[PDB]
C-alpha cells in the first residue's frame, strides 16, 4: 500500500507508441519517514511522511522535538500513508514502476461561492420567453405543506472546490528517479504547486 | 474567480482607470511626492516605474512612448533631463509607497504617500 507526498508541477503530453499521452508531472521524492504508527502504540498501522525541507528558523519548539526524535531535518509538510510500512527510513518515487496504476489525492481548485449551475450543473432558467430575473436560479426547492421543509442535503448555492479530491486508477507513465519525477497520465486535482498524495491504486 | 489575475479595477471602466493612472503619473512626476488612497498608490508604482525606466533609455523612441501616457512635452523633458538621470544606476524601484496613519474624515479612506526615490 505504498504512498508518497509530492507537488503537482504541471501537465504536458509525451509520445508513446505514436500516441500522445496527456500527463501530469509530479515531484514526489524524497519523503523521510518521521513516525511509524503501530498497532501497539497507536492502534493502527501507517507511516507519517515528511516532505520539502523547511527553514529551521520557522520551526517552533514542539515541532523541532518531533523532528529530533526521528533524526530528521525539518520539513514543511507531514502526512501519513495508511497501511504502508517501508523498510527504508526514506520513501522515493522508486516505489513506483511505469505501468502501475495509482490514486492521486489533491486539494481541488477553489470556486468560492458557487451558483447552482456551476456547483450542480443545474439547468437554470430560460433566457427569454419571459423569464424574469431567474436565468441562473434553482427553481423550486420543495413541495407545499407536506412536508413543509427542505431536505437535508438539498443541492443549493454555496462554497465549492478547495476540497479533498482523489482521482483514481491513473497510469504511471514514467518515473525519472534522478529528478524525483513521477509522470501520471491524465489530470490531478488542484493547482500547479499544490500538494498531492500518490498511493497504490485500490482498483483491480 | 480571479485566479492569478493581475490588476486592480478601482471601480472604474477601462478608459477611466487608464486616465486615473496617467493623471496620477503626471502629478507624481511633477511634485515628486503625492498623497492618495493606499490602493491607488500601490498601482501607481508600476505605472510610473515603467515611464522612469523608459526615460533612462533616453532614445527618441522611448520619449515618444512616454509621451503617450504623459503628454506634457515639458514634463517629459523634466523626466528625461532631471529625473531619469538620478536613477542611472538604480535597477527598478524608483518609487516608494508609505502608509499614512490618519484616515480621511468624510469617508474613512486609508491614505498613503507615493514618492520618487532618492
Amino acid at each position: 500500500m505504498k504512498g508518497i507526498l509530492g507537488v503537482k508541477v504541471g501537465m504536458t503530453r509525451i509520445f508513446r507508441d505514436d500516441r500522445a499521452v496527456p500527463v501530469t508531472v509530479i515531484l514526489a521524492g524524497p519523503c523521510p519517514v518521521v513516525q511509524r504508527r503501530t498497532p501497539e502504540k497507536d492502534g493502527y498501522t501507517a507511516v507519517q511522511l515528511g516532505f520539502l525541507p523547511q527553514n529551521p528558523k520557522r520551526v517552533n519548539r514542539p515541532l523541532k522535538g518531533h523532528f529530533a526524535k526521528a533524526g530528521v531535518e525539518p520539513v514543511r509538510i507531514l502526512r501519513e500513508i495508511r497501511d504502508f510500512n517501508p523498510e527504508g527510513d526514506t520513501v522515493t518515487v522508486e516505489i513506483f514502476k511505469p505501468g502501475e496504476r495509482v490514486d492521486v489525492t489533491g486539494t481541488s481548485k477553489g470556486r468560492g461561492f458557487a451558483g447552482v449551475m456551476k456547483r450542480w450543473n443545474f439547468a437554470g432558467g430560460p433566457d427569454s420567453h419571459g423569464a424574469h430575473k431567474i436565468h441562473r436560479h434553482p427553481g423550486s426547492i420543495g413541495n407545499r405543506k407536506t412536508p413543509g421543509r427542505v431536505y437535508k442535503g438539498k443541492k443549493m448555492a454555496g462554497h465549492y472546490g478547495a476540497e479533498r479530491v482523489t482521482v483514481m486508477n491513473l497510469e504511471v507513465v514514467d518515473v525519472i528517479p534522478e529528478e524525483n519525477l513521477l509522470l501520471v497520465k491524465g489530470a490531478v486535482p488542484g493547482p500547479n504547486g499544490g500538494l498531492v498524495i500518490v498511493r497504490e491504486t485500490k482498483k483491480a | 474567480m480571479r485566479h492569478l489575475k493581475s490588476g486592480r479595477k478601482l471601480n472604474r471602466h477601462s478608459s477611466h482607470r487608464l486616465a486615473l493612472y496617467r493623471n496620477q503619473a503626471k502629478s507624481l512626476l511633477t511634485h515628486g511626492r503625492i498623497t492618495t488612497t493606499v490602493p491607488k498608490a500601490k498601482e501607481l508604482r508600476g505605472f510610473v516605474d515603467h515611464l522612469i525606466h523608459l526615460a533612462k533609455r533616453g532614445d527618441l523612441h522611448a520619449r515618444r512612448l512616454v509621451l503617450r501616457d504623459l503628454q506634457d512635452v515639458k514634463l517629459v523633458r523634466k523626466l528625461f533631463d532631471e529625473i531619469a538621470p538620478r536613477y542611472r544606476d538604480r535597477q527598478g524601484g524608483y518609487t516608494r509607497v508609505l502608509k499614512l496613519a490618519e484616515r480621511r474624515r468624510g469617508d474613512g479612506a486609508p491614505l498613503a504617500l507615493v514618492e520618487l526615490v532618492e
Partner: protein, 131 residues
C-alpha cells in the same frame, strides 16, 4: 524548485530540431506516418500553414489545403514523431499571425493576398550553397 524547468526537462526527450523553420503563409508539405492495413505509410499533406500556436514543445501548426473540392485543415504537433520530414514548397508573405481569413477567399483572392516572400526565398537559396 522550478516547475517550468522541470516540464522542459520532461519534454526534452521528445523535442525535435531536425525540422525546417516556416511561417504562416508558407506553403509546406508534411510527410506524415499514417497507419492503415496492415501497414503504415507516409502520406504527404501539402498546403498553406494558417496558424502556428506556440507553447515550446507543445506548439502546433495548422495546414489548409483544398482536396477534390473540399477544404481540409490538419493540425500537427510540431514535435510529433509521426512527421517524417517537412519540405518548404513556397514562402508566402502574410501580414498576420493567423490566417483564418483565407477560408472565405477564392483561389484567385488568396494568391493576391499571399504573394511570394521574395526575401525569404532569396534567403533560402543563399543557404543551400554548401561545402
Amino acid at each position: 524548485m522550478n516547475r517550468g524547468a522541470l516540464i522542459k526537462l520532461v519534454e526534452s526527450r521528445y523535442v525535435r530540431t531536425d525540422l525546417p523553420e516556416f511561417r504562416p503563409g508558407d506553403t509546406v508539405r508534411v510527410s506524415y506516418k499514417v497507419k492503415e492495413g496492415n501497414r503504415t505509410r507516409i502520406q504527404d499533406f501539402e498546403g498553406i500553414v494558417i496558424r502556428i500556436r506556440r507553447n515550446g514543445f507543445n506548439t502546433t501548426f495548422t495546414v489548409r489545403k483544398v482536396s477534390y473540392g473540399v477544404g481540409v485543415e490538419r493540425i500537427f504537433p510540431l514535435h510529433s514523431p509521426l512527421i517524417q520530414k517537412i519540405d518548404i514548397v513556397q514562402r508566402g508573405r502574410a501580414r498576420r499571425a493567423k490566417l483564418y481569413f483565407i477560408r472565405n477567399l477564392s483561389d484567385r483572392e488568396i494568391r493576391r493576398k499571399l504573394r511570394a516572400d521574395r526575401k525569404r526565398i532569396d534567403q533560402d537559396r543563399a543557404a543551400e550553397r554548401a561545402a
